[PDB]
């Protein structure tokens, strides 16, 4: 039984991989940097010798690539799929680089939608299955200077909240959940603004570590809650139901 | 001075083109079916002899096509861009047709985001410009059996509400607006479910006509409101401010 974690080379996906290794889970770890995926596999084997770890060096910003990824796991028993890979951008809309933003849409929205749709197709009536889509507090509240990225997370939040309630009302075995972190200490900011060195310790007054966010993600999987969300002011993690209007 | 209307060959965009014709505006009408674009241009000339009417047969579900559409309009003075083209689907997520849904994402989301970003880049500091993106009441309220489509509209609403407030806070000249129709008598249901003949008169107990929704769109352009939205319970058209949380 496997747990698929996209965006496993760094940040939340990376630490989630390590936390799930400590539970004896076997992993499919997806990202582009093979080097880091291999060093993580080495950590995972010393944490948990009997875990199986499959690596997949895949750019998920290409729709065909995402299809290929999934059909290549057809002969695996996947209990959890975690749509964690995603990128950010800080800039006024009038200043954006469309090539980067277009790529952001293909990763944040499409890849996640392809994998969620395919997982749901084959796993809705299968006992013990979980889908966890990583949104953001930015997917429930709009943040200045990050309009485009926030809107990808609004998509993710609304899509997962509607998929979750679809599967509940239909009596599915598959459970779908959304994680909405707040500021979490990872590479995300450095990628988003395009230059390294951003220091959360010095520049952000409240943030979780990547390990703390792996821990929240794991508790979300271990709950009957659809939404795991960090409060923007208290930075308490809350497991709760949907935030948006449901017309049902 | 031109008003660009994507999705002009039927429905809201078609009736919007005719309304703006009666005000003497010149139009750039974008859709795939040349046939109907020429039929509308004939109507526009009969309403408005002196209106200029450029037609563009373009599939906007291709990102390159959307760039090409815009770069080809750079010789023109565009006062208004209306991202109206969009497509729906009624289906459990487990039952969708990915090729249809992936095309829906490229049109409902990407096309609109390319055209809005490029319009915003060249027109933010230009007096009298207006960007109007068409979302839906299902972009503020999740509707069963249309999870994926509603999420494209949550993207549109959140993107445009965030862009609108970005332009206000930064003193732009450009105004950005979002329209959120409810049931509107168009080809939209027929295209979404794949089969013709859906009858609003017999099947839907409250709905607006396409001409009424073009009127609401024109009301929204002529206001300081960021949002023009049909209330699901009263079916009154409301001009109001943003609905989502703004962190600034
Ligand atoms: N950090 C925060 O404050 C925060 C808050 C809310 C939500 N989030 C969300 O958290 C998730 C993880 O981000 P993070 O904070 O952990 O940042 P991160 O450390 O930069 O991790 C992003 C991950 O995505 C992978 N990735 C990026 N582009 C990819 C592509 N085209 N194909 C495949 N994999 C790709 C990266 O590895 P490769 O580059 O090697 O592929 C990396 O593993 C994202 O959904 C992000 O939006 C972050
Ligand atoms: N009708 C409703 O109840 C309702 C409610 C809320 C929001 N909306 C929104 O209203 C907008 C307009 O839809 P409508 O109700 O007027 O429906 P419609 O009659 O089906 O018109 C849709 C328009 O989109 C164009 N279009 C579709 N795919 C395209 C593509 N790939 N490239 C270029 N143009 C394309 C169509 O023309 P071609 O096929 O010729 O390209 C047509 O002009 C959509 O954004 C829809 O989501 C509708």
Kindly list the residues from chain A whose CB atom is less than 8 angstroms away from the CB atom of residue B104: none
Q: Locate tokens 């698929």: which residue?
A: A4
What is d(CA A9, CA A6) in angstroms, rounded to the nearest whole number? 8
State the SS3 of B151-194: HHHHHHHHHHHHHHHHHHHCCCCCEEEEEECCCEECCHHHHHHC
Q: Which of A128, A161, A140 is nearest to A227 (CA)?
A: A161
Kindly list the residues from chain A whose CB atom is less than 8 angstroms away from the CB atom of residue B154: 154-155, 157-159, 244
- State if residue A134 touches ligand 1 by the CB under 6 angstroms criterion: yes
CA distances from B50 to B23, B26, B34, B46 (A): 11, 8, 22, 10
What would the two tokens of residue B214 be? 């073009």
Residues B4 and B80 sit within 8 Å (Cβ to Cβ): yes
Neighbours of A125 (CB within 10 A): 13
What would the two tokens of residue B91 be? 């289906």
Residues written for chain A: 248
Q: What angle do CA B122, A191, A215 make, to 5 degrees?
A: 130
Residues B135 and B82 sit within 8 Å (Cβ to Cβ): no
Q: What angle do CA B175, B177, B180 make, to 5 degrees?
A: 175
Q: What is the CA radius of gyration of chain B?
A: 17
User: A14 CA to middle of ligand 1, Å?
Assistant: 10
Tell how strand B227-230 and strand B237-240 pair up: antiparallel
- State if residue A139 touches ligand 1 by the CB under 6 angstroms criterion: no
List, in order, residues 6 or more apart from B111 with CB less than 8 Å away. B6, B60, B61, B63, B66, B83, B85
Closest ligand, as measured to the CA of A214: 1
Atom of ligand 2 nearest to the CA of B7: 43
Q: By what technique were these coordinates determined? A: X-ray
What is d(CA B45, CA B55) in angstroms, rounded to the nearest whole number? 13
Q: Which domains does chain A have, with CATH numbers?
A: 2-240 (3.40.50.720)
What is d(CA A65, CA B5) in angstroms, rounded to the nearest whole number? 34
What would the two tokens of residue B207 be? 């709905």
Kindly list the residues from chain A whose CB atom is less than 8 angstroms away from the CB atom of residue B94: 117, 120-121, 124
Find out whether B9 is annotated in a ligand binding site.
yes
User: A104 CA to middle of ligand 2, Å?
Assistant: 25
Considering only the beta carbons, identify the residue of A63, A143, A159 that sits closest to B151.
A159
What is d(CA A213, CA A181) in angstroms, rounded to the nearest whole number? 7
Residues A87 and A134 sit within 8 Å (Cβ to Cβ): no
Q: What angle do CA B92, B97, B100 make, to 5 degrees?
A: 115
Closest ligand, as measured to the CA of A200: 1
User: A141 CA to middle of ligand 2, Å?
Assistant: 28
Q: Locate tokens 């059909």: which residue?
A: A71
- State if residue A228 touches ligand 1 by the CB under 6 angstroms criterion: no
List, in order, residues 6 or more apart from A171 with CB less than 8 Å away. none
List, in order, residues 6 or more apart from B32 with CB less than 8 Å away. B9, B57, B58, B59
DSSP B113-163: HHHHHHHHHHHTTSTT-EEEEE--GGGTEE-TT-HHHHHHHHHHHHHHHHH
- Give the HSE-up count for residue B169: Cα atoms under 13 Å, Cβ half-sphere: 15
Neighbours of B91 (CB within 10 A): 18
Resolution to 1 decimal place, in Å: 2.7
Nearest CA distance, B92 vs chain A (angstrom): 7
Residues A244 and B158 sit within 8 Å (Cβ to Cβ): no
CA distances from B221 to A32, A34, B83, B129 (A): 45, 50, 13, 10
User: B132 CA to middle of ligand 2, Å?
Assistant: 14
What is d(CA B7, CA B81) in angstroms, rounded to the nearest whole number? 12
Ligand 2 surroundings by CB, under 6 angstroms: B 6-13, 31-33, 59-61, 84-88, 107, 134, 136, 181, 183-184, 186-188, 191
What is d(CA A19, CA A40) in angstroms, rounded to the nearest whole number? 12
Of B4, B6, B12, which is best to mutate to test ligand 2, by the most ligand atoms within 8 angstroms of its C-beta? B12
Kindly list the residues from chain A whose CB atom is less than 8 angstroms away from the CB atom of residue B244: 141-142, 154
Partners of B177 in the β-ladder? B132
Contact B244 A92 (CB under 8 A): no
What would the two tokens of residue B13 be? 């965009």
What would the two tokens of residue B106 be? 């490229």
DSSP state, residue A109: I
């Amino acid at each position: 039984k496997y747990t698929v974690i996209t965006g496993a080379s760094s940040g939340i996906g990376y630490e989630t991989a390590k936390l799930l290794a400590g539970k004896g889970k076997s992993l499919v770890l997806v990202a582009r940097r093979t080097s880091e995926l291999e060093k993580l596999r080495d950590e995972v084997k010393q944490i948990s010798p009997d875990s199986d770890v499959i690596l997949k060096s895949v750019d998920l910003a290409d729709n065909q690539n995402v299809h290929d990824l999934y059909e290549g796991l057809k002969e695996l028993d996947i209990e959890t799929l975690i749509n964690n890979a995603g990128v950010g951008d800080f800039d006024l809309v009038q200043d954006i680089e469309l090539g980067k933003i277009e790529k952001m849409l293909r990763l944040n929205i499409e890849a996640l939608t392809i994998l969620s749709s395919l997982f749901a197709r084959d796993h809705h009536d299968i006992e013990g299955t979980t889908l966890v889509n990583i949104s953001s507090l930015g997917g429930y509240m709009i943040v200045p200077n990050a309009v485009t990225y926030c809107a990808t997370k609004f998509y993710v939040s609304a899509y997962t909240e509607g998929l979750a309630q679809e599967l509940q009302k239909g009596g599915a075995k598959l459970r779908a959940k959304v994680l909405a972190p707040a500021a979490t200490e990872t590479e995300f900011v450095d990628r988003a603004r395009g230059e390294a060195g951003f220091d959360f310790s010095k520049a952000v007054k409240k943030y979780h570590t990547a390990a703390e966010m792996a821990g929240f993600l794991h508790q979300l999987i271990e709950s009957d809650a659809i939404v795991g969300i960090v409060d923007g002011e208290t930075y308490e993690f809350e497991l709760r139901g949907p935030l948006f209007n449901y017309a049902g």
